[PDB]
Write a protein that binds this ligand. Sequence first.
Ligand code: HEM
Ligand code: HEM
Ligand SMILES: CCN(CCc1ccc(NC(=N)c2cccs2)cc1)Cc1cccc(NC(=N)c2cccs2)c1
Ligand SMILES: CCN(CCc1ccc(NC(=N)c2cccs2)cc1)Cc1cccc(NC(=N)c2cccs2)c1
Ligand SMILES: C[C@H](O)[C@H](O)[C@H]1CNc2nc(N)[nH]c(=O)c2N1
Ligand SMILES: C[C@H](O)[C@H](O)[C@H]1CNc2nc(N)[nH]c(=O)c2N1
Ligand SMILES: [Cl-]
Ligand SMILES: [Cl-]
Lengths: 362, 362
Amino acid sequence: EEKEILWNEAKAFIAACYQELGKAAEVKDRLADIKSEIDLTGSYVHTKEELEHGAKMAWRNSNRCIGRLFWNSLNVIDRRDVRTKEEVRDALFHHIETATNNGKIRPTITIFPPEEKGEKQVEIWNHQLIRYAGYESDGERIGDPASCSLTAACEELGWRGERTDFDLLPLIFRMKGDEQPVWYELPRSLVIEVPITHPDIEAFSDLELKWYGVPIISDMKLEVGGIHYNAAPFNGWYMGTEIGARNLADEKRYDKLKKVASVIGIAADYNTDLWKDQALVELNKAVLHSYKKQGVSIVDHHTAASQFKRFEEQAEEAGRKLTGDWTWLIPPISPAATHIFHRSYDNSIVKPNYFYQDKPYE
Amino acid sequence: EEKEILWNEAKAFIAACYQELGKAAEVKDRLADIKSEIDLTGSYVHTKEELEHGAKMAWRNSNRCIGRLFWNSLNVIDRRDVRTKEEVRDALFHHIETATNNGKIRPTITIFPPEEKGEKQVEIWNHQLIRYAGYESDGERIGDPASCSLTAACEELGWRGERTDFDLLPLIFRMKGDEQPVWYELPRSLVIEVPITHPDIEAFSDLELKWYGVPIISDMKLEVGGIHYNAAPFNGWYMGTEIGARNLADEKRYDKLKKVASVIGIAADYNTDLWKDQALVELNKAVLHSYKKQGVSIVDHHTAASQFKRFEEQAEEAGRKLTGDWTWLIPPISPAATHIFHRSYDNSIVKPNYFYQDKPYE
Ligand code: HEM
Ligand code: HEM
Ligand SMILES: CCN(CCc1ccc(NC(=N)c2cccs2)cc1)Cc1cccc(NC(=N)c2cccs2)c1
Ligand SMILES: CCN(CCc1ccc(NC(=N)c2cccs2)cc1)Cc1cccc(NC(=N)c2cccs2)c1
Ligand SMILES: C[C@H](O)[C@H](O)[C@H]1CNc2nc(N)[nH]c(=O)c2N1
Ligand SMILES: C[C@H](O)[C@H](O)[C@H]1CNc2nc(N)[nH]c(=O)c2N1
Ligand SMILES: [Cl-]
Ligand SMILES: [Cl-]
């Protein structure tokens, strides 16, 4: 049944992939090599081309992603060769560097060896490669609550955060054969951060807000033709609302709106004043302004929505069925101002794709 | 099969309804009377109590409605007695008057005779009892585009709009036996309207915006225990975003955001300025301010969301399953600022309920 799932998935991916790459006549032969390889080894190894296009396809199939227009230009780094934690660390360091690209962010994925018998070769603990720690000690909240459990797990392994609101978590990951993960402090010279200022309102800097430049998701499983790449960190750039409307605004995150309201000089007393909405808008304007001023790639939700419309059009133009999760595609501010809000999407799961997988801690 | 659908629906409604009304011991007897009545007449007639509670239940079951907390206080007017168009008109006029209640809006439903063999007794053409007309003549857009087809149909029947942006449509409805509907101009003394001004920004009145006080939906079918009340106009008060974020903001509606941006003194040139979002917020603040200043009931989306949370809690407290349509429950501005955004809802259809039905024109 396992070998059969793998074989079925492989036939479907190879046929589709080679169709897209104009390699349709190589399918029969390639499928044979695969079937022998599976019968002999219990698995199979992707060609560079297959792996690259699989990564792109997987992005194209991400129902929740609004930034899919640029799926075909994903920069793919093949690190299936790594065997050592030094090699894993250096590959991660490198991913940060080349993705960041001095602020001109390059959408990049680094692909590590896949699971074998469901056995991971490399198991990454970070949610993102760059993320802030979180502390909840008897009433005292510091930093990013989202990171509380990972931060605690890391503080078991001999690490210690400074307990500012913006401690960078180290890389933490475990190698097959090892009982505990290792951790490595990030070289600060690799991490670009952006101070949040506002274009009109001088006092906004009193909040002393900042965010990191590059969101690099490192806890999702890339699935390509039956092969499970549990360790395959990927990055794009931010949509502004992600920082301004969620990370800095959520009560369960940094919870800044009341402070935003105060520094922008409005009362936060009455629901009917719509102070939350007003604070949300200024904070999000601040975010967009700050990233642009700092030479760090970012997109506003109107432009993003506008780009995603082009993606919908391209799919139709290419005869590809379009899938999407409406509940995640709509931006958390002014959703009815985008076309997404006014149409529906089929939320069917298509592979290749990126999937959630169990956290290795907690 | 028809009589069987009716009988099944009736058993389910009577049992549930009488359970809620502490009348559980009357179910067996009441069900018998119903079964005889159906076998003899092909239908059955609701008691006043049944009809009233059915109307309330139907509201409680409206997955898309955020205002459901107040379901049990719905004011029900039983007009199953009407036979003439004069009687229908007067019942509609009256509904407007008592619902409006000088601005202190009373959630009210007026229930007309139900369909017999799927044959309507009274067929209402209006979407709402109070609504603005719409004209689209070679490039020239006037009024509310949503009302274009109904306005045209009405202008077949000898009526003529003045072609302002805010022409009130007359009541239009048809009686069983008649080939054409009749129409009646609304007495202006019955219609409260609100000029949109802004609390801080004097120039906002230059836009010369207004909206009507009371939204009275008059084109949905109320279904209670197998009985189809196709004609049963109902009203609540407005949630501010309905006017500020949709009716006045939608490009396919009044499309005012660029004009809002100009009178509030911001540029409407760059997506990254978030001028749409900023314009949305000021316009919605204007709406809330204007309705409150005029002594007309309205609710902001935070308070509404807050009330709907209490409704969720009540359902649980009463052992009632809760149903909801997440895509409609989230407000079109700052949705992530409400709890609704951060949970899920079962979108199952439960009866009694209000349903769409085919437009009689177009
Ligand atoms: C190029 C810029 C990109 C932008 C602006 C963008 C935007 C977004 C946003 C706003 C979300 C929702 C995130 C949230 O609410 O937490 C999202 C989700 C997602 N994006 Fe993208 N994205 C981009 C590139 C990419 C890339 C390069 C990949 C992978 C190759 C990707 C795959 C995904 C996936 C898998 C999700 C779903 C995550 C989940 O389910 O939690 N995106 N994207
Ligand atoms: C008391 C104040 C009320 C408020 C503030 C309220 C709020 C809302 C809002 C904002 C919507 C979405 C409308 C849209 O986006 O077009 C809605 C939908 C709805 N409401 Fe309510 N509502 C109220 C009372 C009522 C009453 C009295 C009824 C009926 C007895 C009702 C039944 C419904 C139904 C059936 C829908 C769905 C309409 C559709 O599918 O298009 N509501 N409500
Ligand atoms: C933090 C919010 N999301 C992920 C949301 C999420 C993911 C996974 C879980 N799973 C859980 N185990 C938990 C749920 C609740 C507590 S833990 C919960 C939430 C991060 C994210 C994902 C994908 C894209 C982006 N934004 C981006 N622009 C990109 C990053 C990388 C490429 S594009 C952000
Ligand atoms: C105009 C927007 N909605 C209804 C949305 C809608 C309904 C029905 C259709 N059906 C169609 N036939 C069409 C679709 C497209 C063109 S016509 C389309 C849209 C009006 C509405 C419905 C229910 C509640 C409210 N708001 C209110 N606060 C209340 C009114 C009455 C009681 S509460 C507003
Ligand atoms: C319950 C709800 O579906 C869920 O909380 C979603 C709503 N849509 C979202 N959309 C995005 N982009 N990100 C999120 O975290 C959420 N939360
Ligand atoms: C396609 C989408 O589901 C649809 O256009 C909905 C979204 N949610 C909505 N919610 C409300 N309250 N009103 C609407 O008109 C819509 N439009
Ligand atoms: Cl993030
Ligand atoms: Cl409306």
